[PDB]
Amino acid sequence: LKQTENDLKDIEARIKEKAGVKESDTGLAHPLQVARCTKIIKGEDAKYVINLKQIAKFVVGLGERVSPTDIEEGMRVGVDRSKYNIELPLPPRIDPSVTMMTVEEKPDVTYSDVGGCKDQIEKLREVVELPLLSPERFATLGIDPPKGILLYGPPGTGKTLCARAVANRTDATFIRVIGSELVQKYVGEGARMVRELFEMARTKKACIIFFDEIDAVGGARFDDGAGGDNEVQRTMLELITQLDGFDPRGNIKVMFATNRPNTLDPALLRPGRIDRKVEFSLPDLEGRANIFRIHSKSMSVERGIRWELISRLCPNSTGAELRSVCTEAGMFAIRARRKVATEKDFLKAVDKVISGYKK
């Protein structure tokens, strides 16, 4: 097998390199990330001659032609940054972005770090849980749920597991899209990724489209709003033309996550699209107690401890600061050389968070 594939360059690759390179490079020129043509004269109809490079840009006039399969020669055909006329039917949509997309239908997450967040659930009960369960109730109310729902709170807390808890009661599909990964070297990845989200939301009713880290995208940015390239500038079009105009409000819903509302486009913050603003508070004495008892099932502890007094000494804390109390509880047991964490280990773990941080 080793010596068999060595001589294929002189036999099989001679035809492969001719049809895969010489034909593509003919005249200074199947996933297509690039296309180029130099001085091609073809009699308006299948003219093409489009240079994807920012240098020496071309246009196509003289009528309109639709050829989604093969425009002119096949081979190298592309759109990339600037969309010119009749080149729309064949966009270069290929990209290994599958690692970015995370789709979970009917998540099983109920309460882990979100114990005590039922106050925020009631905020999402009317405008999210209600339409995804009985959308026909809004017919007699006369109004309909708003398009989007805005999330607010501490950075990196409450925007992950709290969104999946609502989808459990409604048996919806939770799709998390990271906004920082929407920005790549390919111009238009943010707008193209949003296009496929509404396409999958029309097939299956009652789906949740979630956008993680919208500050990296927003409605505008430097390279798009202030720049010449179009990525986020074309992303806002998919949140307006598709969601508002074509898509009904009951079946398709949109939710974002951001640290500050001012980091977004004021055009999106206006009513008609983004209305509900959900602020993430911190769990109370009852909420912080239900989180510690769940983590105590996977961690060896003493059967005679009390999780109510553990959450009582600790003030209001985020979802991470509460998990730190259980993880640090095993560190103090190492000094005492014990297999389980006694009540005194949790008391020292709370003082480590109070004194070590003081926030």
Added chain:
Amino acid sequence: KPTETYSDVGGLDKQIEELVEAIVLPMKRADKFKDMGIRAPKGALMYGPPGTGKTLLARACAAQTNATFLKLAAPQLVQMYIGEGAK
């Protein structure tokens, strides 16, 4: 020719009186000003918070005279290569 009237948004009649005077009157019937030789105003400066009727009565003033609505967004006027919003 968007479809809107002045009764869809009320309470702005104080501002509408200034809009109709500087927009509808010089546009709809210009024969009163042309007989005097004076030049009719082609626009009026408008300012205010969003949603106060500046963009709400835009299509309303265009619907009364049956005109085409063309909106120019501020983020759309800044690009890299010279062109676009300038055109």
